[PDB]
Design a protein around this ligand. Sequence first.
Ligand SMILES: CCCCCCCCCCCCCCCC(=O)N[C@@H](CO)CSC[C@@H](COC(=O)CCCCCCCCCCCCCCC)OC(=O)CCCCCCCCCCCCCCC
Lengths: 229, 229, 14, 409, 396
Amino acid sequence: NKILLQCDNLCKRYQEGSVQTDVLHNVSFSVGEGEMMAIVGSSGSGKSTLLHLLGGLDTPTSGDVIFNGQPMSKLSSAAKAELRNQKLGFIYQFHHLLPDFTALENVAMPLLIGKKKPAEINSRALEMLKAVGLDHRANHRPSELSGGERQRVAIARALVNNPRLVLADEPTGNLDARNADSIFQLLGELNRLQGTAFLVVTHDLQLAKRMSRQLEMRDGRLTAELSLM
Amino acid sequence: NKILLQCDNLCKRYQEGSVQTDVLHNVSFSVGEGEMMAIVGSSGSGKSTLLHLLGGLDTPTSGDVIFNGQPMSKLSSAAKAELRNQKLGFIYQFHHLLPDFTALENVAMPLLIGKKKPAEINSRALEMLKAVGLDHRANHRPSELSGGERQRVAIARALVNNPRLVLADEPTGNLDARNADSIFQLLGELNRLQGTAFLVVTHDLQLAKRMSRQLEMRDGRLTAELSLM
Amino acid sequence: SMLSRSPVEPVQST
Amino acid sequence: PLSLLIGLRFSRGRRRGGMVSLISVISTIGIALGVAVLIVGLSAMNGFERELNNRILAVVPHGEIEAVDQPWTNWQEALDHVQKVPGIAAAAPYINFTGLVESGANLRAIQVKGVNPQQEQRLSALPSFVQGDAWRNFKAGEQQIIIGKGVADALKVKQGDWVSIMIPNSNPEHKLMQPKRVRLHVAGILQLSGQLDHSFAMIPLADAQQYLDMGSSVSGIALKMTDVFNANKLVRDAGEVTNSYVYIKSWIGTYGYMYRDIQMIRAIMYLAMVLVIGVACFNIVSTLVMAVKDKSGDIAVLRTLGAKDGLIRAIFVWYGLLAGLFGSLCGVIIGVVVSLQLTPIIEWIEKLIGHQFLSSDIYFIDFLPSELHWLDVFYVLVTALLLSLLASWYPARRASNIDPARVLS
Amino acid sequence: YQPVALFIGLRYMRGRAADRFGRFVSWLSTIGITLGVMALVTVLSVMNGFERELQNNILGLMPQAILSSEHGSLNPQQLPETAVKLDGVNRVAPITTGDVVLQSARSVAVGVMLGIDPAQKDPLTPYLVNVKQTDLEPGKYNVILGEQLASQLGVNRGDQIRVMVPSASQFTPMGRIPSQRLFNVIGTFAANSEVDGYEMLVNIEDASRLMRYPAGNITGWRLWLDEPLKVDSLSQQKLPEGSKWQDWRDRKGELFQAVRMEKNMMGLLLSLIVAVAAFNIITSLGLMVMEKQGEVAILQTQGLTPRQIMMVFMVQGASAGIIGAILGAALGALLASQLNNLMPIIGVLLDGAALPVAIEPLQVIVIALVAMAIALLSTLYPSWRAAATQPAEALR
Ligand SMILES: CCCCCCCCCCCCCCCC(=O)N[C@@H](CO)CSC[C@@H](COC(=O)CCCCCCCCCCCCCCC)OC(=O)CCCCCCCCCCCCCCC
């Protein structure tokens, strides 16, 4: 069936023998291109470790991930950086901003690493700033900013390069309604026009229930994997 | 009336201008010696910052606190340290223990700071161990211990010198029922014999109904103020 | 050696 | 112990091995290198002082009284008058010639000293430095001469060999021509130091008097002090007792450059190695700053229990002071292991690297000496601890006045 | 475009303006390297000045090089001065050198006889006191003694001294008779140097005839060198056929060798400072990585290669090393050649010149580059470890 992505027995072990608790064994997932997959669950239930492993940061102990016949482990680390830079969008739980860099510099960092010419990237950044309307705070330090502001800076940084997969671990957990409504509207037009895949894990039942596809990782067992269409 | 502590229009601000929120105005509280007061409310309703301010860790933004006629602002830090070490007992939300010390050392520390002779603290620790029954923990490391045990050791440390003011921010969150009943009984005989005032802030309404006095901080108004005796 | 530059004749025999 | 033992647990609380314990190892390496090499230097210069005390200033005439106009007619009276001056341990007469020493077609111009053996025995420890000679058969009126090692090996001569000595004996009359060519018998070989053996050659005083055909007179009086560091004014006062026409000389004028060089080198070592310990204390400052930034939670837990605003500072001061103690002791161990086997270490280095260090006679001791004065070790270790405490003081004050809850929220 | 790691590396070195102490902690390595390079530069300049004074007082007043013939004396007609061309040599003059014994009416001494032509000036000529250089005519047996040599000999102007050379001795049944001649002193040379203790000046003809050389011959050509302390390298040059090259290393070499070995020693005794400073850099990174790993993780979720994280930490280490070395060398140059100004305001122990200062820019550049290289070697390891270590293992 699926050819673009093939995940087989994604597992992680970092302990000795006979001490590893049998939480998950022979767990496989069906990841499809173009679809906005959402995962539901509770905090501290072992959801962040897998998504950190899904970013290509670490090599899985068991199982294989195949992209049209090319293993990542035999593939060079430069290709892994390329995948993490222009193919995959990754967000941590926290803001994890860079205090030594300004908000504009942190936003342009995904492009700055991408070795793109300053002219067009700066023009697009200025146009985006004019569209948003947050031009006033450009030289101020991230340390003296609020949680919602830095969280939205992190979201913008994640959406600068327009990755195919934008992984967002509770992007509105630290957001109040004033920023949350704008973030949800932004995600709405991104899904309507751009259509980039978002992996949004959030706790609210009502918001996640409206989604076409819902995956559940509870107690390490495939309990709820529902697709209406 | 209360003589040791006099609070007038106690207020706390933790932000700068502009984004400052006018959520609290002219809110003063009645702390009575010998009575165990319980504070109820929802998350993010200023339940932890106020409990932090009562310990003298920071200076209150607005209002006056008088200790026997000596203003806190003009009061030296040595007097505040003496108050925190000999008269007031403070319990943090989280574990907030010392990972490098054993449980016996963590219990002994409050009087060790008080420059007390080693004999009585050693005797007190030995008596505590004999009476409670932690003789089984002779080979295990303090770092690799459980959560309920470490929380109860934190409580024991807070109860070493029998402070007049025993502030407990969620004392039963990490404690199960088998520990909860024992902690409630312990609080019972401490209140009956020592008579120390307890400021217990906890979230469960059903269990908080069992407290002697319940106070309500809702919408900035003192609406519900119930005292059984 | 290096500070050998000592005035070779500082005697000024009294 | 005292209630500050927290520092111990703050120092032994090391986990996640690698790049968190390597820091302490590197700081210990820096402190140990600085302290150990400072101790080795100080011990080597103490050994230099000891070797100068033994080999050079204990054989040279500490004071020199030379008549300028005529040879001393009443040297006996002056000798008795100067021997009773306090601060003088001994006195002796001497006569100072200079002549052509010749043997085996090899010729040199060397200075010759004539002194009574029984008096020069009291005057200095010079005869104790002779490699081998007949201390009983060495006397006057026997054509006996004793030669330093340098002159002997430059003349390719050994013990019991005949040597020609040419003396001018110039006179206003026609007797100045045909300089006296006497013969002498070599009886001993001196081994003083890297420089002194190339110039000293002695004959008995009566032999010198017979060789010049002069009366009962000597060319000067040599003096041995009890205290040598103030020999200038002492010899000036001693010569003031005799006639004022005489010329006074002190061994200070000749060998005070050695004292001032030893003191200057010791000062240079101390200053440079204080700089080294200061850099290692920069390491300690960094380590304690990171310790504060990593144990802010623990110090907050301590402060919410009623800790004083100087207790946390004391915890981190002793943390730094103990980090200093570890390196300082690990360096003192090397500084005592070395400086006691320092000479064999230098010999092994010479075997490994074919290059001679203190030889070549432009110094006063071919080898490198060593002597460990534990007072110097105490001074070095106190310097290291004082620098560590000065380093640790400010991070401690920074730790004392920070509350993580106040600044993070 | 510049490497992106340069921006991040240069930006981590700054900031922390709310406390003004973390920046000082991060710049401690630069301060230590600066102090070490300062000490190295100033003490090496002082010792270079001291050995320059020795060179201008010992070697500056004695034959710096001698080109002679393989067997016997040198024939000026056979080897003309016009054909004597070599590197580093800026002047060549005929000379005869000998080891002599001087016998006076009062004492005897040993010295070095320099037979020179009066028409050509010598570094000894400006120091002559009441004695005309041209007064050393041939056949007159004219000798000028050093002040200390004259005091040792106990003679003055108008007095005769018997000069003898044993190297030209004649063997007979009456023994070996060294060559001897009476010489008339007409003055003294006052230089206040070790050379004045044994060196005397005579006419080249008289000395040449005295060494039993054939008439008209000379011992050799005295060669002045722009850099005589490197004479050993100049000892390996191609020489004219039938000639041999000798230098001061025969007589005053070991001393100078020792001096160099001294300089070199105080050359490591202070270099250890920057060596320790190198270790300091390690600790800084070994802390700063631990203080910024949570940020490196973010840089790892972006397109930065681990080999580029190693670059962004090594560039910070190298920037600290370069700033420290350059600023320390600058303040060493600024502080040297100025100690002679600061010393007067306090007690002075030395007499005459306060402190000789000879700043050779080559030495300063070499030691600054060595400090930079040691800083790079130190910063290589923590940078590599930060690159190779994933954040999860350190955090978990
Ligand atoms: C390692 C192998 C062993 C080597 C043995 C070498 C021993 C030689 C020295 C012995 C001294 C003997 C005493 C008699 C000396 C003498 O007669 N006459 C004189 C001969 O000329 C002494 S000159 C003294 C020299 C000596 O130089 C030495 O120090 C050598 C010391 C070594 C002694 C040997 C003991 C063993 C220690 C070995 C150290 C190496 C450690 C290894 C690390 C792994 O000092 C000087 O350079 C003179 C001072 C000139 C410089 C003045 C500087 C002015 C400062 C201006 C202010 C600037 C600002 C600065 C701050 C920013």
